[PDB]
Structures are given as structure tokens and as C-alpha cells.
Amino acid sequence: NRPILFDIVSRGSTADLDGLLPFLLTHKKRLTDEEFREPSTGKTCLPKALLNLSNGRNDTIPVLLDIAERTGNMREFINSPFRDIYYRGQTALHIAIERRCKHYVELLVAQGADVHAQARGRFFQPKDEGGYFYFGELPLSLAACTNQPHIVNYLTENPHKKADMRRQDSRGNTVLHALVAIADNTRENTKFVTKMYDLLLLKCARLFPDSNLEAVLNNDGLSPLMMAAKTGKIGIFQHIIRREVTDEDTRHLSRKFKDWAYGPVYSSLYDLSSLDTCGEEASVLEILVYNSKIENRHEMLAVEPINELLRDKWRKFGAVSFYINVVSYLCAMVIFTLTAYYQPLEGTPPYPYRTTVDYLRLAGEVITLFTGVLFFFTNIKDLFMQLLYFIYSVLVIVSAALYLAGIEAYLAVMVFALVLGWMNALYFTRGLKLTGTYSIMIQKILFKDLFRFLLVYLLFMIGYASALVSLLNPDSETFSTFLLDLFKLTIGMGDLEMLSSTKYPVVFIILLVTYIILTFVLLLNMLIALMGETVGQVSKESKHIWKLQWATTILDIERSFPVFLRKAFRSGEMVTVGKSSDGTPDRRWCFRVDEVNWSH
Amino acid sequence: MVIFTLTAYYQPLEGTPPYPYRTTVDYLRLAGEVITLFTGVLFFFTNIKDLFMQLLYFIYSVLVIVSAALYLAGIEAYLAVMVFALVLGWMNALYFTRGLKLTGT
Amino acid sequence: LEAVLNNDGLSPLMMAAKTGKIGIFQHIIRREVTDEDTRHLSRKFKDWAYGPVYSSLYDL
Ligand SMILES: CC(C)CCC[C@@H](C)[C@H]1CC[C@H]2[C@@H]3CC=C4C[C@@H](OC(=O)CCC(=O)O)CC[C@]4(C)[C@H]3CC[C@]12C
């Protein structure tokens, strides 16, 4: 009778249902029997009826509910979930809410519909995880994510059942987490996202004054603000960072207060407790600056307190430590250079020391080894809990070890270390503004475009030179010699005296001509062109890249210091902005900004 | 192309073309030669079918086949054109980066 | 009607593509007919919708 029932419900006709009650009573067959349910998914009668209706009025639902109550299977029938990978978990209430039918939502909850049921089927998953619509996996989160204020209002405060706002799905995300998860930078989306977020926050605070809704964290460990920063959602991040609440009852949770005004000058202090931390917990700034592949990484930093905080930190302690570090690094490299220079050529390593000058060389050596081990330890700690610096440190330590063992080879690698030691000194110009943007651009072009160009050139050059070598007739040694000669000719110095043994010299001349033409005219020119266009495309990006580089250097310096030193240098003044519900003072960290307005 | 490069490199300078084969190394060179000729004839057939029903590849194939023919006939000149083929063989390897996005533009 | 081909062997869609006419090519590639009598000749149908997600299958 399953096909007949499905046809009856799909049609929506009331008459066909007559007689089902006595039929079930006589045969004592429940509406959740395997035969009645569709084997493919598990869909029961109610979801099918709700799926296909007219102008929000199916007109069959009450009869189905009455029948199920007659049987006495409402508990297992009204909330019967779907099976299968695609739609697992989905219940009738999810459908009713998805179809924007308040009437049916009320009628469903009135009868005992499970309001906390989770719909974690593969249809409802994040876009990156092979899904279509992620909404928090809850009826309440669904209504909040589909921009339906009335549904959320009724659902939260209903006599029969209440879905508390502070509730977490399998992933741990709460309704605010989902509402940030579906946010997009479009104006239409943000306009309702912010409104619903604020409404829901105020309602939760009103109902429960003790707890805080944004305190909750998901399994990942983030909060709505940190997650919005991580997911690159400027629209809601900017509205949460400057949230101000005029209501006196709910002013405690506000984030931006007015401090004082004199004429056109207005001075307001922002709150940055969660925004900036000293190792107590993860900070928005660290996440936004250090994580990669962020949509609006550069735009997100242009917010009223963020930029001024970076500025104040830079003045307070950023500049001094940077100059100290660069000077010390240069001095250390000079000491290393002197040590390598004065390495005694005579004898074999290690060399005995029996004079004060020997002890001077030893002092330089120990300083260099200390620097190398320090860099190695810093990199290893970073890995456990700067690739070029890692190479420098590992090469230094290996050179010291081979010096201890006894072999000439160490000097080579030791010298190589010195090369790298200066090769990256340019990267310390990063902190400087005028030359730091140029250093960042040089590093960017060097790694991305120069890797491709070099890889393109290597095989071409080696194969073409091998072809020319094969052309000549009087053979690894011959190739080894000729390759040096050919590279020297590529430099523009030398002479092609080796062609005497070759037959058909004309074609060899032509081939060398074309080789030179390609190497100098086309290959070299394209490298020139690429730099010119990239800078033009990033002409505006220059300031963005510079600001990001400045931020990352400042944050690296801040991270390096231990916790208590950070406590000493922490920026912002403790300001008692009000008294909590119990009356005790807040005493919350804040940072002050003042502007000028001639229109207010 | 690597196989072709090795074949050209190990072409015996001594003697005159064709060179008799009486050793396993000779058969290694012969295997490389037949592979190169197969590649050339395949490219030639593809281009000829396109024409009946890639100009640089057409040049590569025609030069390879001509070099093989002149190797069979007996003349030193073939090596020249054979080498020239190898040049073109790599000269257009860059054009296979086309498919890649970053370097294809 | 679009089955007919000229001496060249093309159809209105192929000819619009060959002649570089975006305006009519885009309107012929997404042609949808609401009338039930003449829905067979339509080229873009709606498949299903869930909330803000809409899924339509084109004919190719
Ligand atoms: C254009 C870019 C992408 C390719 C990099 C060029 C190198 C692959 C070339 C440039 C100079 C060449 C070298 C010139 C001299 C020698 C020594 C030679 O061995 C000898 O010592 C005998 C000759 C001599 O002693 O001068 C072996 C090859 C090598 C390293 C040559 C091999 C290839 C080198 C490093």
C-alpha cells in the first residue's frame, strides 16, 4: 500500500485518506513499518507531504497527525529521520522550517517534535567538505541562517519546548558560529547577518545574565570573532569589533564605549581583551596575520583599533628591538667572517692553540657556534610547537662537527654558511619602510617567478649543449671541458677555438648564433618584462605588502619575549567602564582613539 | 627527447654510416634509434592526417625521418640535420608548459 | 525548426557561435519555456532548490 499512500499524499487530496484509520486498526500496522517507508532513504509520510504542498497549505498534515496519534506512534513517527549518506538526520521540522511555513512549525512543536535533532547528512556540510548548505545542524540555527526572525522568536520562547541558544552540534559550532559560517561580503547577506547576530546575542544575554554566549568555543577552539577572522569575513568582523549597546541592561557586553568629547574632538575607547592577548589565549591579531590563504587579509587589518594598536606597539617597543637585532646580527656576521678569514691554512683540522691569537680565533669560533646553535634551537622549537636561517644554523653546526672530526671539507661548507649568512642580511631590511617593500618584492619575485624560469632554462640549456657536443667529432671528459667553455662564452668572455675538429662548421656557427640569440634577446628580455608588469599590478599592493610585513615583524618580536615581559609591555589602560549585574566593577582593558568631526 | 639525445650522443664517430652492429651496446643504440624513428613517424602521421582531414612538430618529424633515410643511404650530413632535429626537439618543449596555468600564460 | 541546416551544414546556434554573436547565443543556450505544451524544446530546466541553494541542469 506504500505506492498508494505516496500517491495520495503527493496529490494532496483529503478524500483518498478516508478508510486508512480502520485499515490500520484492523491490520494493526504502524506508519513506521519498513513496507510503508521508502527503502531508498527512509522518508515517512509527513516529510513527503511537507515537501510538496501548495501556497503553504498542504491541508493533509492534521489528518496524518491524528491518525498517528490514534495508532500511538507519534513519538517515533513525527520525528522519524532519514537514512543514507546524503540526507542523514533530517526530520520533519527541518523541512517545515526550510519551507518558510510558520504554521506547520508551530503545529509540529505542539505535538512533541524533537527541536534539537541534528541533520548532519552529506547534503548539509561545508562547501569545502563536499556539501551544499551548512547551517549549524539544528532547527534554531537553520531558522537563524535562513533570515526568519519570527521563527527564531517563536522557537526560542515556546511553552511546549524551547531550544536554548547556547547549544552545540557535533562539530561544536553554535548558532552564532553558523551565522558567521554562512556570512558573505555581499551587502544583502551582511545586512541580515549582523541584525540576526545582534538580536540573538541580546536575547541570550537577557535570558541568561550570568553566562556569555560568545564565550562558547567549538571543537576547533575558536569563537565567532576568531572564526570570522580566520575565514576572512570582514562584514561581520567589523560589526563585532565595534559593537556598542545603548541599552543600559545589556551595555556590559558592548565593545566600544564613548569616553569624552570636547568640541569637534571625540574620544572613544575600544575593548581589546580577546583581540590582543599576551599568551593567555589565541589572539585575533596573530590568527589574522600569521595564517595563510585569507580572503581579505589586507583589508581586514584596516580597522579603527587594529591599526592604531600596531602603531602604538611599534612606537613603544617595536622599533628598538628591531634595530638592536639587525645590528647584533651584522656584528655576528662580521665576527664569523673574521673567524673564517683567519682560519690557519697550515696544518690539519683541528689545530692546536698555544698562543693568545689562537685564543682569539677560538673566541670567535665559539661565538659563531653559539649563534648557530641558538638559531637551530629557535627553528626546532618552532617546528616542535625561517627556512634560510635553519639552513644557516644546520650548516654552521655541521661545519663545527667536521672541524672537530678532521677534514678539509668543512672549510668549504663553513664558507658556504658565511655566504648564506650575508645572503639573507637583505631580508632584515624588511622592517624598514622605504627599502622593506623593495625587499619583500625581491623575495616574492625571486621565489615564484625565478624558480619557474630557472627550471625552464636548466633542461633546455643542458640538452642543447649536449646536442652541440654530440655534433663535434674528434666522451664524458670532452663534454665536461666543453661545457665550461660554452658557459664562459655565454658570459661573453672566451674564444671558440675548439671547433677545429668539427665537420660542417657552418651549422655549428648557426646553432651557436641561435643559442646566443635565445639566451640574450628572448629569455633575458622576458625576465625583464615580468618584473615591470608585476610591480604595476601591485602598485597599490606595495602599501599592503609593506603593512603586512611590518605587522609580521612586530608580532614576531612580541612573540619572542616571555610571558611576563609581555605583561610588562602590554598596551592599553585598565578602565572601569561600568558595574556588572551584581554591581562589581568590570575593570576591562581598553585602547583609546580620538577623531575630529565637523558635521556632528 | 632524453632517449633521442642519448642516441645522438652515442653515435659512433668512427666509421661511416650505416655502422654494423655486432655487440649488445650496438643493439642498445639500435633500440634508441628505433624508438626515435617511431616517435618521428607517429608525429608525421598525426600531422599528415590533420592536413588530409603543429608546424614545428611537423618540422621535427620530417627532419627525423630525413635523417634516418640519409643514415640508411650513407653520408655524414645526416648527423647535422639529426642534431638539428634534437635542437627543435627541445626548442618546443617550452610550448608544453602551455597547459600549466602559472607558466602557460 | 532548429533541426534544419543550411547548405553549409550549420544550425542557428552553431552559426551564431561561428559569427560571434553573443547576444542571441546566450539567449539560445539558456532558453527555458514555462508553457507546458512547448516545454519540450526548452534548454534549461530547474532541478531542485533548498534554501538559498538553487540547482538547475542545462542541456548540452
Ligand atoms: C643558467 C643556469 C640556469 C644554469 C647554471 C650553470 C651551471 C650548470 C654551469 C655554469 C658553469 C659550469 C661549470 C664550469 C666548470 C666546471 C668544472 C668541471 O670539472 C672540472 O674541474 C674540469 C674543468 C676545470 O677544471 O675547469 C665540471 C663542470 C663544472 C662544475 C661546470 C658545470 C656546469 C656549470 C656549473
Numbering used by the authors:
A (entry chain A): 150 to 534, 550 to 638, 662 to 787
B (entry chain C): 482 to 534, 550 to 601
C (entry chain C): 362 to 421
Provide the authors' original text about this structure.
TRPV4 is a polymodal, calcium-permeable cation channel that has emerged as a potential therapeutic target in multiple conditions. TRPV4, expressed in the plasma membrane of a wide range of cell types, is a polymodal ion channel whose gating is controlled by multiple endogenous lipids, and exogenous stimuli including synthetic ligands, cell swelling, shear stress, moderate heat, and ultraviolet light. Human TRPV4 adopts a two-layered homotetrameric architecture where RhoA attaches to the bottom layer. RhoA appears to act as an auxiliary subunit, interacting with the ARD through three loops connecting AR2-AR3, AR3-AR4, AR4-AR5, and with the membrane bilayer through the prenylated C-terminal tail.
Three additional complex structures were determined in the presence of distinct ligands: the antagonist GSK2798745-bound TRPV4-RhoA complex in the closed state, the agonist GSK1016790A-bound TRPV4-RhoA in the open state, and the agonist 4α-phorbol 12,13-didecanoate-bound TRPV4-RhoA in the putative open state (ligands are abbreviated as GSK279, GSK101, and 4α–PDD, respectively). In our ligand-bound 3D cryo-EM reconstructions, we identified strong and unambiguous EM densities corresponding to GSK279 (antagonist), GSK101 (agonist), and 4α-PDD (agonist) located at a shared site within the cavity between the VSLD and the TRP domain (termed here the VSLD cavity). For 4α−PDD binding poses, we tested three poses, and pose III remains relatively stable while the other two poses are dynamic, supporting that pose III is likely the binding mode of 4α-PDD to TRPV4. Although the EM density for the pore domain in the ligand-free state and the 4α-PDD-bound structures was resolved sub-optimally, the high-quality reconstructions for the GSK279-bound closed state and the GSK101-bound open state enabled us to unambiguously model the register and assign the gate residues.
